[PDB]
């Protein structure tokens with residue numbers, strides 16, 4: 001089968017364990033065993049919470065092909081779909097988990113080089129989506145996955161539109177115009193990018209923690225923003241603050257964020273002030289708890305050598 005979006009039979013994959021139980025579905029660790037091909041590919045399987053009509057299923061398939069068409073090292077591709085009473089979505093298993101949990105878990109061994117490199121990687125992935133004319137609408141550190149500690153990828157950019165974001169909800173990541181008027185653009189994704197950077201620089205703080213979602217548009221209109229993370233120089237904070245300008249056309253563009261964070265990544269200790277920075281190290285595959293705790297098969301990347 002050479003289809004870009006594989007249509008899977010239930011016999012071709014198995015849910016082995018639960019990973020995560022999220023707003024719109026449950027994600028499982030499993031194996032994809034493509035019929036006749038005698039090979040087992042570690043995958044994540046998301047099973048949607050609600051049963052869908054044959055009408056829901058048509059809109060899902062059309063969007064699914066877009067999600068299987070992306071080809072960028074910083075973007076998670078949809079490998080396949082299975083349409084039964086439930087919809088199941090299959091992707092490569094990202095065996096270090098999401099970046100939000102990763103920065104909370106490793107908050108004492110993450111140095112300036114890693115944080116700035118992730119900022120670059122996320123900006124490159126978002127710029128690739130902008131080139132595909134795709135608005136994410138739900139960018140957050142929970143939706144960035146860790147392939148290796150050195151390399152992260154954007155996911156879950158195919159949800160918000162189909163779930164009705166643009167018609168009559170991650171308020172604390174949303175641009176003011178998204179809250180007020182359901183306007184979603186690459187420039188509203190820049191706002192979410194700024195909040196995602198804030199989550200990384202705070203080692204996974206909750207934005208506006210304990211502030212009611214219903215009060216966020218008012219505090220944004222009064223000019224209040226997320227506070228400067230303790231490790232950040234004013235050079236890095238000013239990038240975040242520029243992502244949260246009310247004028248969406250004045251916010252940085254992803255291609256400008258790639259250039260500026262790439263510059264900072266060349267001299268990372270100038271731009272982030274982390275005690276113990278120089279001596280910091282993160283578990284490899286072999287050493288990682290999280291890694292062995294998924295895995296211990298052919299990796300999706302090997303199998304798909306086009």
Ligand SMILES: O=C(Nc1nccs1)[C@@H](c1ncn2c1CCC2)N1Cc2c(cc(C#Cc3ccc(CN4CCC(CO)CC4)cc3)cc2C(F)(F)F)C1=O
Nearest residue numbers: 044045046060063064067076077078089156157158162164
């Ligand atoms: O698959 C996904 N995540 C995974 N993680 C692990 C394994 S798979 C993520 C995702 N997005 C981008 N990517 C990924 C993975 C790789 C890259 N996706 C793609 C994805 C998801 C959801 C839906 C959905 C839905 C849905 C639609 C209509 C109703 C009914 N409602 C219509 C609207 C009406 C209100 O107007 C009310 C009723 C219900 C649901 C579709 C897709 C897509 F695009 F593939 F078709 C989803 O989450």
